[PDB]
Each structure stands twice: as structure tokens, then as C-alpha cells.
């Protein structure tokens, strides 16, 4: 009496609208009892020829395993192809019906969904993260070795999982990122779209991508879930959080002026140096438009690093996302007892830390959601968790308006402008002369619905900054995402 396990049917993964993303598909695994096979050797060359194997290599396998009362031959043939072999009627050739995953959207949502191993266990993406929920519990039955004595346990199927992903926005993001990588001859890239109200990840695409239905020649670079794994210094894209701290201090208002002449600031031995050095007096919006490191450094010395560090920590920078995905990196938000001037300045202009595109999107979602953080979700949210109010609604509103001016004002990031709508955001450049071009923003600016981060890894064409490399991708994908979600033009 042997106990043999009945595989459970793995749960269906859908997008937020019920579009199938991962489906357990019937296949046939052909095993054999060598000791039986050993009695039908004249059938072997026909079995071999069928099974794709070579006659002598196949004969060699069976002969040495002449002791074992079981071994596999082939796993997950089609039901009717593996029947053309059950049609040879070779003694000792029995078969199991099994499930394999199919991924209808393939490379478009590869990293987010991931894939299963040969045992049908989650190995990447959601397949891994919700392996328990999807796998179910296999059943078993007592068998003589002849006859199935009884089902001693019932194989219960895995449960259905609806992702936060909108496959329509995922196709738009995948296509627009792919096109931007080839126009800038870039190595790699990420694009994350979030619902600012619900914490839902509506799209997560990485380039390069792969077909999880065919992982034969799978390069590790194609497999890398960059949005959740790649850490970088977010540079000018975290200046809105430095500004949030400045406006919450009671010492700063948007019409306040900082003298950034002559584009440099000596702090003892170290000199802070602006990317553009053609300014004296700038208002707070101007400090953002110019991305003046001098401007944000003087504000940071006035308010203290502690206030900036606290805002950055509260919007989740350098913190666990709680998404429980395989590779994900948390990055680093460094803390100090005593913040010297250098570390105060570098934190303020975004080199004092490292973040992922997902953390950066999540921080932008909090700012867009009038200062209320909502936990990240890769699964459809029906009941929205209570937020944490991490930035006062009034500060969040003021910083939103500044970021709208960053995109729309004269001297601003005009390429980020969204045809149809008011958008808000900040470009950045994170040096690895290899660098990442960043853009982080949300729309509509006056009533935000969507936050988005674009990362372009080593753009290898003339165009340098976030403000012309990443910003146009944000424009096209945001215009598309807002209309697919029937968000009314403002």
C-alpha cells in the first residue's frame, strides 16, 4: 500500500478586470516502471523515436535504472501528443495528467506575474509571493503495487487572485517604455503607475523583458524585476519632500526668496555646485524648476536635516514596501544623531539615500493623495485601508501646485506636459558618465488620481537629463492611463 499525491489545480491569476494573466493548463507526464519496460525491449526504439530521444541514449537510460520500479520519461507533453505515445501501447509506460501555467499576456506582464518551476511552484513575481494562496493543497490516495484503494485526502484547488494591474495600462506602459529605450538607445528601464487613493500598482513594466511561456534562452538581465530591485540615489525627485519639510517648519512660504549666486556654496572643505549657475534670487518654485542644490541646501540648513529625514521616512523612502516579492531591495535612508552641513545638503538634494522606483512612486502617491500614505498593493483593493496623514493636506496641496508650475511654468519641464490635463512632477538624474534618467509625477495636478515613475537606465543619445529623456514617456503613458480610467480632462 503506497500513498501517491493528486496535484491541486493552481489558482487563476487575473488583472483587476478579470483578464487572465496565469492559467493552469492540462498536460501529461509519462513515467515508466523500468522492470516492466525491461520486458518489452523491442518496443524501445519506437518509444525513443516518439519521445524525441535517440535510440541508444534512451536504451542506456532504461538499462541502468532496471532496479527502480518508477522513473519519469518526459514531463508536461500535450494531452493528445503524449497520447500518440500511449497509442504505441508499450508495456511499463503509464501516465499522470498534470497542470502547467500559461501566461496569455506573456512578456507584457512577465516581472509582475512571474512564473512557476517544473514542480508548478512559484519561482518569481506574484506566483512566488502568493504561492500558498495559488497552490491549494494536493490530495492523496492509497494504491496497491493494481487498484486505487480509496482517496484518503481530497485535492482542493488553489484560489483565484485578482492583481491591482490594469492590463490595458500595462500594455500602454510596456509599449511606451520599449519605444523610449530604442529612441534613447538605453540599456534598461522601469515604469510604475499607482492609484494615489488606493495604493494599487496599476502598471509595473521593466525592459528588457522575456516570454515566461518560453524561458529556454532566458538571460538573467531580462529576468531582473528592476522596479523593485534596482536602488539609486533619487536626486532632484526627492526635493519635493525637502520642500514639504520646509513648508511644515513655519519658517518658509512659496514666495520666499533664496540667493543662490554664484551657483556654488562652500561648506568648509566641500563646495555645493548647481547644474545651472545663471541665477541670484529664486523663489521656492524656482529652486525646484532650476533644481538648485545650493537653493535647497540653504533651506535645509535653516530647517535642519531631522525635519527632511522624518518626511522622507514617513513617505516610505528606504523602508520595506510590505509587498513580500522575492528580490525586493529596501534601499537606504541614512540616519544621524548630529547632521553636519554636508550630509544635511546631500539628503536635501537626494544623494543622501537610495530608493527603488516602487518606493519613489509610493512617496509621490502620498504627496498626490493630499499627504495621506496608503499601503502599496499588487492585488485589487476593494476596501481602501485608512491612510496615514504623513504630510498636512495644506502642505501637500502647496507642493502639488509647485510641481504643477515645475511642469507648466516658463523654464519648466514642458515635455512632461500631458495633452488634455494639468500634470505635476520633477525630473532627476542619478549618476551610477553612466546614469539613470528619472521622472516622477502625478495627474491631474489639481485633483490627483495617478502617480507615475519612469526610470531610463543609461540613455546613450545626446539628450542627458530626466527633463527630456524620461519626461516625454510620462507625458504619453499618463495621457493614455488617465483616458483609459475615464478621468475627465482638467
Residues 160, 252, single domain; the answer is: no
Residues 385, 480, single domain; the answer is: no
Q: Which of 129, 164, 199 is the last residue of a domain?
A: 164
220 part of a folded domain: no
- Based on the structure, what is the number of domains in the chain? 3
Residues 44, 142, single domain; the answer is: yes
In 3D, which of 338, 366, 334 has the Cα closest to residue 350? Answer: 334
Q: For residue 344, what is the domain's CATH number?
A: 3.40.710.10
- How far is Cα 252 from Cα 254, in angstroms, rounded to an integer? 7
Q: For residue 461, what is the domain's CATH number?
A: 3.30.450.330
- How far is Cα 2 from Cα 97, in angstroms, rounded to an integer? 19
Residues 330, 413, single domain; the answer is: no
- Which residues form the catalytic set? 236
Residues 395, 361, single domain; the answer is: yes
- How far is Cα 295 from Cα 62, in angstroms, rounded to an integer? 76
- How far is Cα 13 from Cα 109, in angstroms, rounded to an integer? 12
Q: Which of 369, 386, 406 is the last residue of a domain?
A: 406
Q: Which of 384, 406, 428 is the last residue of a domain?
A: 406
Q: Collapse the DSSP code of 152 into the 3-class scheme (helix H, G, I; strand E, B; otherwise coil) and give the result.
A: strand
From the CA atom positions of the chain, what is the Rg in Å? 28
- How far is Cα 191 from Cα 179, in angstroms, rounded to an integer? 13
Q: Which residues contact 46 (CB under 8 A, 6 or more apart)?
A: 88, 90
**What would the grid cell of residue 179 be?**
519605444
**What would the grid cell of residue 280 be?**
541670484
Residues 236, 194, single domain; the answer is: no
Residue 136 DSSP symbol: -
Residues 382, 435, single domain; the answer is: no
**Which residue's C-alpha cell is 527630456?**
468
Sign of the Cα torsion 38, 41, 46, 52 reads: positive
In 3D, which of 67, 14, 60 has the Cα closest to residue 41? Answer: 60
Residues 106, 237, single domain; the answer is: no
- How far is Cα 244 from Cα 261, in angstroms, rounded to an integer? 24
Q: What is the DSSP string of 451-462?
A: EEEEEEE---SS
Residue 256 structural domain: 225-406
Residues 69, 38 contacting (CB under 8 angstroms): no
Give the method used.
X-ray
Amino acid at each position: 500500500v503506497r500513498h501517491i499525491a493528486i496535484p491541486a489545480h493552481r489558482g487563476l491569476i487575473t488583472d483587476r478586470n478579470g483578464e487572465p494573466l496565469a492559467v493552469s493548463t492540462p498536460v501529461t507526464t509519462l513515467w515508466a516502471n523500468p522492470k516492466e519496460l525491461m520486458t518489452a525491449k523491442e518496443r524501445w526504439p519506437q518509444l525513443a523515436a516518439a519521445l524525441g530521444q535517440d535510440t541508444k541514449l534512451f536504451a542506456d537510460r532504461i538499462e541502468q535504472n532496471a532496479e527502480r520500479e518508477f522513473i519519469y520519461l518526459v514531463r508536461g507533453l500535450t494531452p493528445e501528443q503524449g497520447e500518440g505515445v500511449i497509442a504505441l501501447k508499450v508495456p511499463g509506460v503509464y501516465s499522470i495528467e498534470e497542470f502547467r501555467r500559461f501566461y496569455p499576456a506573456g512578456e507584457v506582464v512577465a516581472h509582475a506575474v512571474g512564473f512557476t518551476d517544473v514542480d508548478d511552484r512559484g519561482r518569481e513575481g506574484i506566483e512566488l509571493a502568493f504561492d500558498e494562496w495559488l497552490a491549494g493543497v494536493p490530495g492523496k490516495r492509497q494504491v496497491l503495487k493494481i487498484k486505487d484503494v480509496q482517496v484518503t485526502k481530497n485535492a482542493k484547488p488553489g484560489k483565484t487572485l485578482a492583481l491591482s494591474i490594469d492590463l490595458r495600462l500595462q500594455y500602454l506602459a510596456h509599449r511606451e517604455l520599449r519605444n523610449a529605450l530604442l529612441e534613447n538607445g538605453a540599456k534598461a528601464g522601469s515604469l510604475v503607475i499607482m492609484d494615489v487613493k488606493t495604493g494599487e500598482i496599476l502598471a509595473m513594466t521593466n525592459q528588457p523583458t522575456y516570454n515566461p511561456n518560453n524561458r529556454r534562452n532566458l538571460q538573467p538581465a531580462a529576468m531582473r524585476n528592476r522596479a523593485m530591485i534596482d536602488v539609486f540615489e533619487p536626486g532632484s525627485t526627492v526635493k519635493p519632500f525637502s520642500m514639504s519639510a520646509a513648508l511644515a517648519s513655519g519658517r518658509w512660504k512659496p514666495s520666499d526668496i533664496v540667493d543662490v549666486y554664484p551657483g556654488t556654496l562652500q561648506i568648509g572643505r566641500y563646495t555645493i555646485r548647481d547644474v545651472s549657475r545663471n541665477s541670484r534670487q529664486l523663489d521656492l518654485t524656482g529652486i525646484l524648476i532650476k533644481s538648485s542644490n545650493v537653493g535647497i541646501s540653504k533651506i535645509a540648513f535653516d530647517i535642519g536635516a531631522e525635519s527632511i529625514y522624518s518626511v522622507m521616512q514617513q513617505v516610505g523612502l528606504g523602508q520595506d514596501t510590505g509587498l513580500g516579492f522575492p528580490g525586493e531591495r529596501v534601499g537606504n535612508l541614512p540616519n544621524h544623531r548630529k547632521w553636519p552641513k554636508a550630509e544635511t545638503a546631500t539628503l536635501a538634494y537626494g544623494y543622501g539615500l537610495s530608493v527603488t522606483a516602487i518606493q519613489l512612486a509610493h512617496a509621490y502617491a502620498a504627496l498626490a493623495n493630499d499627504g495621506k500614505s496608503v499601503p502599496l498593493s499588487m492585488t485589487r483593493v476593494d476596501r481602501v485601508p485608512d491612510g496615514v496623514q504623513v504630510i498636512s493636506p495644506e502642505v501637500a496641496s502647496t507642493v502639488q501646485g509647485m510641481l504643477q508650475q515645475v511642469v507648466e511654468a516658463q523654464g519648466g519641464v514642458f515635455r512632461a506636459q500631458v495633452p488634455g490635463y494639468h500634470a505635476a512632477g520633477k525630473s532627476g538624474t542619478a549618476r551610477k558618465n553612466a546614469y539613470r534618467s528619472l521622472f516622477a509625477g502625478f495627474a491631474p495636478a489639481t485633483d490627483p488620481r495617478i502617480a507615475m515613475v519612469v526610470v531610463i537606465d543609461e540613455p546613450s543619445k545626446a539628450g542627458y537629463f530626466g527633463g527630456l529623456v524620461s519626461a516625454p514617456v510620462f507625458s504619453k503613458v499618463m495621457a493614455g492611463a488617465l483616458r483609459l480610467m475615464n478621468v475627465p480632462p482638467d
